[PDB]
Design a protein around this ligand. Structure first.
Ligand code: ME7
Ligand code: ME7
Lengths: 418, 418, 418
């Protein structure tokens, strides 16, 4: 009944559904042809077909409804949008548009939408009355994003220690420093699982730029939520196009008072793609960086905020450091003072194969009093006076064994004193 | 048993085959996933498997057996060929090979061929004892190819005109010049049906480059022989890649003493693709083209010949004129006298809606005496003298009724005399 | 035993001769490498091997003895000559060098000449006693080349027309003007047969520039002399490389008092090739022809002369007109008042299937009184006074039938006066 529903429908049932109408030789045809044939079998008979997609506007008022499972890639299955649809209902990039799909006209290879039934998971008359995200008033992160799973496993301790190292709240524009071979991938999956566990209501999203497909498949199954990525073989134009429209989806949910969490890996690659896409300004930076190239990621990264009116937008990007590229240091420096949170994976402890390997002394955050309680920050203040005077390699080994024995971090906070 | 069987098989059989050895979740995943699963199912069990493909030689000696069905696009199913494999068994680009497939190693995403069974329908030892294509002795086309279908259909009437305008022999380097918007695509479709019916032994290959997918899909459904095509959506790097792959595969068939016919659409746009990929040389001719840019497309067009020792290589290409761009016009001027067969097309006939649409008086073939007989040529020559003073529009209108009122071209000549 | 014998040995026999030593898998290689491979078999045997070539001194100081059968292509069989070797015997480009060849040493990718047995069909010491070409005094041609076959055959009639239209003498810098499809190649084939038939003593060379591969092999099976060519698939620099090797080899034979005849097809193609190769001079004429580009082909065309010291140099270069390109028209405008004789072909006579299609009114030669006798020239003027009032086709038609009535032109002269 729904075009997107037929996409996930198993091919075994697709032939049976098509053959019930009276189709033929569906087994030999491709799955897309079977889906298109069912669209053809209802276009002639006048039967309405449902569907939905994410708006992807263009320069002439026309747009397409890209699919999340398609990584927002252009294709025949995308629902074409017309400039008239903007006149009927105010249209913005990243909008979730749902409605009955009309048959295409002559010369159109994409099925058009006769009318819109739902906008951003809500009625068009009510979704058009939402205040813009840019006109909102940002506020400091106050609602702490609890991450402690409490399972007692080794990976459970990882979520516990990140709360102790640098607390993360809703709308906190975080940032992490990743030296090569620091196990950054494992912690992100562990963090995402706790995100879906602790806060199933939030729209947890994962964005991967210039990443190998093996981790892309791993992210989709491990993360209990929508996962989008751009292949490492894709050109830089795809990387900037994917990332720009991802935040458009995130912003509309913020306009609908929905908490959004975006995991980015890596902002260094995203900045590198943006540098190669924009035209040269004539003034270059050290390491071969365009002057106005840094402006684009700032808008993307700077949007992460805890909106005072309602909802939040959290972006946790990954900074590539000590990777041997001169472009990596300049990107990190340009974003050094941008994020409200900093985490530094310890490569020295990584060579010791101790996971997680976090530089507790170097890592930290600002305005953590809002996230912490009256006594929560006091306990970690004592821990600050303990780990900092000594080395972090031995301290990380010390807390890992003690955190396993302790059930809760509050209970864990008591055992060092006694 | 064979990899190509898995690639071309209705999905219902793979579901049954997968469940035979206990493979599950077959309906949920895509068609290529179960193919990977079933192939890996035999990899663990040690069951013998087979495969085939068209060899693509890279700059390092490694290569992948590209698939003709996928327009020689990149894919996981391409069999990896090591640089030592081609040294153990002397192979070249475009060679059709088959054998047993070994499972990929860890860290390798492509299957490999441990042993080679057949090379272009021949043993690898016997195939390596074959004369190279370039060292052969080219000659004029002497074996006449019967273009007329003889069934009397409407498309047969179009076919009869070509025998009266420009006879085609084996290995003849033909050439078609045609302004757009004249139904050129369907005119070449009549050629494919005639050649396949009249000469099923000849390897009929059709290349479509830089065309809409609607015409690409129409070619496969209407041509019995192999068709390799790529749309203009792909970059020019694929255009040369899809053109170089086809001709090299065709060349090896000549070494196997087999006639091969290539139909190209279009050479004019093909040269532009070569004009873009070629690196800058510092000297640019008028119209934005480079002299070195036109060298390589000449080599592709110059490969057509009637080899005396055995086999042939017939190339028929269509040139685009009246496009309002100096890039296209300079190609026809450069490729003017290169082809033995020259068929002209005019929009004036196209406006008159006369099918076929060819400038009869100006079109002809050189060294046609080897193809036609003495009586046929004498009848042919008197036809040209009578048709010469008449205009292009009137010649076609006078000719169509004369051939329609008859059955065969030989019988058509009887009524012209009588 | 003999390198040049292996070069002319057919490739089918080359594989069989390679099995005499015991070497296998020579089929999947070029024709040049097969001779190179089998030479190494005899290199270890120590048997002296004979061979020859055409010297091409490189800019560094060494050179190679390119093979005429290889069309002066840079192949593995090119014998290397030390720069000191051209100091013992003063040699320049185009010298014919024959002698024994030593096996290559370690790291020597090319063979080497151990002894200079003969230079230009003479002793090496006698080679240094010949005056340079430019120091020779040019002179008007006076030794008539009797082009008439004398057998009264059908093809002899074409030679009868040419001798009646514009006599050719030793050193006559001819120029043939021909529109497309005017039966140009038929005339050149007819000329070449007559020259080798009537005058076997004079050295005959045929140069084909930008010619289809079908025609090159057709010519090599008819002309009883050296034939070199460069197909259009070869680069532009290859078009001028063979042309330089032809004139330089021709000049050396003039120094030894040998009449060398060069039939060129065509001067337009050679001029276009030279335009591409040479750098732009900043002064571009109409049609894209560089002003400084035409200095090189003129020198090639300007070498034809009747040297007073003995010998000559005859060049009959075909010119292309009405090709639809302004570049070809500019070239002809710079060679109009250059040739010693002209021969205009007419497409109109060709369309009437009258051969040879020679414009008798326009074609002619200058200072023809030196070639013919005072009475034969008087007879020729009678035909001039007859043809000139007539047309160009009817007079040509009148020429064909009257010439076919008799066997020799002097007999045709008798019947015209009666
Ligand atoms: O697109 C605009 C913007 C103003 C306007 O009148 N239109 C045309 C409306 N329109 C479509 O676009 C398709 C069918 C149809 O009636
Ligand atoms: O090869 C070069 C280049 C400059 C030079 O002096 N030489 C050596 C000359 N030389 C040979 O090579 C063999 C015998 C002989 O006298």
């Amino acid at each position: 009944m729904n075009l997107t529903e037929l996409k996930n429908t198993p091919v075994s049932e697709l032939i049976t559904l098509g053959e019930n109408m009276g189709l033929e030789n569906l087994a030999r045809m491709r799955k897309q042809d079977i889906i298109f044939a069912i669209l053809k079998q209802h276009a002639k008979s006048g039967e309405d077909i449902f569907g939905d997609g994410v708006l992807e506007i263009l320069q002439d008022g026309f747009g397409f409804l890209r699919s999340a499972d398609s990584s927002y890639l252009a294709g025949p299955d995308d629902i074409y949008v017309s400039p008239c649809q903007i006149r009927r209902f105010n249209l913005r990039t990243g909008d979730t548009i749902s409605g009955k799909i009309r048959p295409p006209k002559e010369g159109e290879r994409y099925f058009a939408l006769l009318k819109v039934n739902e906008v951003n998971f809500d009625k068009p008359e009510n979704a058009r009355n939402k205040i813009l995200f840019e006109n909102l008033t940002p506020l400091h992160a106050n609602s702490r994003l609890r991450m402690e799973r409490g399972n007692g496993s080794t990976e459970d301790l990882t979520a516990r220690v990140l709360d102790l190292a640098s607390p993360i709240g809703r709308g906190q524009r975080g940032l992490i420093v990743a030296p090569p071979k620091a196990g950054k991938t494992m912690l992100l999956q562990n963090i995402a699982q706790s995100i879906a566990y602790n806060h199933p209501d939030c729209v947890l999203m994962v964005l991967l730029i210039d990443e190998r497909p093996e981790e892309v498949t791993e992210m989709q199954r491990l993360v209990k939520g929508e996962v989008v990525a751009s292949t490492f073989d894709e050109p830089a134009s795809r990387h900037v196009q994917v990332a720009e429209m991802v935040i458009e989806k995130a912003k509309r949910l913020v306009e609908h008072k929905k908490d959004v969490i975006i995991l980015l890996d890596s902002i260094t690659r995203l900045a590198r793609a943006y540098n190669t896409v924009v035209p040269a300004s004539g003034k270059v930076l050290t390491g071969g960086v365009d002057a106005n190239a840094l402006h684009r990621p700032k808008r993307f990264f700077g949007a992460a905020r805890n909106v005072e009116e309602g909802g939040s937008l959290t972006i946790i990007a990954t900074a590539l450091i000590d990777t041997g590229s001169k472009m990596d240091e300049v990107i990190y420096e340009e974003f050094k003072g941008t994020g409200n949170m900093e985490l530094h994976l310890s490569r020295k402890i990584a060579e010791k194969r101790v996971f997680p390997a976090i530089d507790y002394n170097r890592s930290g955050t600002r305005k953590e009093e809002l996230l912490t309680t009256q006594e929560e920050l006091q306990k970690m203040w004592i821990l600050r006076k303990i780990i900092h005077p000594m080395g972090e390699i031995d301290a990380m080994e010390f807390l890992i064994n003690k955190l396993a024995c302790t059930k809760t971090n509050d209970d864990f906070f008591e055992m060092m004193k006694r």
